Amino acid sequence: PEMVRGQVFDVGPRYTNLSYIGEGAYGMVCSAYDNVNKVRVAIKKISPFEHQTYCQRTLREIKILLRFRHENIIGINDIIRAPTIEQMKDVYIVQDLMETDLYKLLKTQHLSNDHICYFLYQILRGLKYIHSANVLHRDLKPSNLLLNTTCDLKICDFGLARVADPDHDHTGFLTEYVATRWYRAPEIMLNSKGYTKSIDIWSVGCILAEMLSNRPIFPGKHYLDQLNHILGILGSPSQEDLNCIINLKARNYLLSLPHKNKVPWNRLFPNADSKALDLLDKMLTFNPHKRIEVEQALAHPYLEQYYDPSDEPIAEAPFELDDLPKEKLKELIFEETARFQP
Numbered sequence: 001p002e003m004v005r006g007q008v009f010d011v012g013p014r015y016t017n018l019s020y021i022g023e024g025a026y027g028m029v030c031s032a033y034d035n036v037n038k039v040r041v042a043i044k045k046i047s048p049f050e051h052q053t054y055c056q057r058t059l060r061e062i063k064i065l066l067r068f069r070h071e072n073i074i075g076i077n078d079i080i081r082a083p084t085i086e087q088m089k090d091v092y093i094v095q096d097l098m099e100t101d102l103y104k105l106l107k108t109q110h111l112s113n114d115h116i117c118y119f120l121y122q123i124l125r126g127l128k129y130i131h132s133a134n135v136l137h138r139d140l141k142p143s144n145l146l147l148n149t150t151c152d153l154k155i156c157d158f159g160l161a162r163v164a165d166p167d168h169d170h171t172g173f174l175t176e177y178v179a180t181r182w183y184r185a186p187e188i189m190l191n192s193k194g195y196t197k198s199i200d201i202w203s204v205g206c207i208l209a210e211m212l213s214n215r216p217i218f219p220g221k222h223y224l225d226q227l228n229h230i231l232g233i234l235g236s237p238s239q240e241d242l243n244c245i246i247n248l249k250a251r252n253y254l255l256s257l258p259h260k261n262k263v264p265w266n267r268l269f270p271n272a273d274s275k276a277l278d279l280l281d282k283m284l285t286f287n288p289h290k291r292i293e294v295e296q297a298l299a300h301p302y303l304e305q306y307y308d309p310s311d312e313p314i315a316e317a318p319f320e321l322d323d324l325p326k327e328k329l330k331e332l333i334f335e336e337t338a339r340f341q342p
């Protein structure tokens with residue numbers, strides 16, 4: 001077996017000429033030369049089988065990415081594992097290699113207004129398909145937006161995705177949450193489990209703001225600080241928006257704060273296109289019921305050069321793991337990956 005950094009990275013004779021990339025969210029990832037399709041590919045090694053929560057996220061991603069087929073969503077090209085459940089310890093997921101990502105690009109490149117527009121279009125076009133499948137991504141951020149040399153954009157990492165469940169979204173105040181802090185909507189900290197499509201639109205809003213200035217807009221240093229940063233820019237919520245929060249601990253926390261003024265977007269982003277700021281405002285709306293939806297966002301004047309609903313496909317087949325034990329989830333991972341065996 002191929003070895004990388006002194007660890008097994010056993011991708012078989014199909015995949016040769018390995019090169020270390022890094023230790024991605026759930027293990028090692030390498031590029032490799034695909035001897036069948038004659039291109040370099042990305043391969044991540046997953047070792048989830050000792051833990052039920054890791055089985056769950058691995059299975060979630062595999063099931064979702066195998067069903068989805070969309071230009072702005074990363075596919076799965078191939079899955080490598082042992083021929084039997086007993087011998088299966090690792091799974092290698094093979095995907096199109098993408099030269100960079102929006103996190104890397106934002107750390108050293110100024111984006112033109114045309115690049116911002118085109119990136120936002122592609123994010124929303126992918127997101128339209130995801131939401132049309134009744135799925136929430138729940139971890140949109142620059143590092144999950146892959147880009148190739150011609151700036152084609154693909155959304156990555158469906159490990160934290162869920163089927164939407166708006167009727168069960170309500171929870172109490174300061175309920176712990178899994179997804180990345182700077183891109184978390186204000187309601188996560190107040191009264192929401194992140195089971196509605198509006199949680200993804202907030203994340204896209206944060207990404208848009210980050211494209212405009214190369215700095216995260218709400219860089220919270222820990223959990224409740226994130227809400228401090230959001231309110232610092234949006235200002236104090238209105239009475240109507242407070243009345244939408246029935247939970248008393250969350251309501252009374254917001255009422256306890258001194259008045260904070262809205263910072264105008266054109267002062268924060270003096271070089272931005274005014275249409276980009278109007279769409280930004282609508283994505284970063286405090287009240288998630290008033291927040292713009294993905295299809296409205298595509299139809300916004302900022303994106304008029306690209307908007308074409310007939311070329312913005314939806315899923316044909318929209319989508320309990322939570323308490324299946326890990327033994328059962330290994331079997332389901334084995335089954336979900338069987339089509340890639342000879």
Ligand SMILES: *CCC(=O)N1CCCC[C@@H]1c1cncn1C
Binds near residue numbers: 042146
């Ligand atoms: C979800 C992000 C991810 O898997 N990658 C981006 C960072 C490098 C490794 C991954 C990559 C590169 N090209 C394609 N893919 C999936």
